[PDB]
Subunit: 158 residues, 2 copies
């Protein structure tokens, strides 16, 4: 599932990680798990690339990390070199409210797939979560997390 | 509030024996989201008593090591609801079972259900039982869960889970 129609320019802004799911439990469980990354901002570039600004918990404290995502020939598919991942896929977005994406490594998706439901504002959006759950129905997820507003505000976010 | 629906007509005597914790879900992420999390507990056996009480043998990771625990569940007038005083919880709720393959249960603290509700899908044999998971997910549909984990056979047989 990819958004063939994607205009990356209109995803610019602050976002919050509302829910996360992954194929391997160890990718998400612990607060410092490798794919337990909280998105804070998306910054599209003039050439159609994407900077993903996120925070992680590392050694008991928040730390910022920036991931550079390169456009490819395939719509809504970006390539990265971070977190032992090499792809970012944008499944769907309405631009105004929510965006669904996954990260993976092409060489072993079973052992690397993590997807998120992002929202622009720190509120629970059940419409967005329903679309998220529908989209991963066919995906081999073994852990899923969903956050409340206190957590959206308070989890390593500027 | 969190309204629950426990198993009408449960016969606790038929649940005895070995079980494996196949999947877990909780209302509050911190209940489960660490090897050491308070409700990250792996059931080993269910042992109904002649008086209709229930001992739950389990293990969890605590102070660096996999520890054995024994939780005593006292019967109430509802056969599928038991009183406990362990893991900061005060109730065990049996939601459903077919006796022979799977059993779904939860623990909670009646004083703060949103901060305490953790449910599991148990199976009698160390394999991923997909119909058991489907029944677990349906039983969870009206519970406000914010974390769900499902284990594979290596994990079911892995140290602390057996």
């Amino acid at each position: 599932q990819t958004m063939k129609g994607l205009d990356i320019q209109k995803v610019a802004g602050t976002w919050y990680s509302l829910a996360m799911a992954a194929s391997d439990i160890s990718l998400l469980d612990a607060q410092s798990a490798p794919l337990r990354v909280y998105v804070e901002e998306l910054k599209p570039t003039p050439e159609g690339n994407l900077e993903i600004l996120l925070q992680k918990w590392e050694n008991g404290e928040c730390a910022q990390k920036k991931i550079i995502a390169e456009k490819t020939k395939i719509p809504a598919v970006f390539k990265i070199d971070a977190l032992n991942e090499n792809k970012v896929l944008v499944l769907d977005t309405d631009y105004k409210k929510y965006l669904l994406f996954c990260m993976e490594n092409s060489a072993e998706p079973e052992q690397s797939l993590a997807c998120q439901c992002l929202v622009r504002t720190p509120e629970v959006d059940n419409e967005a979560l329903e679309k998220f759950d529908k989209a991963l129905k066919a995906l081999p997820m073994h852990i899923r997390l969903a956050f409340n507003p206190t957590q959206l505000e308070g989890q390593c976010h500027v």
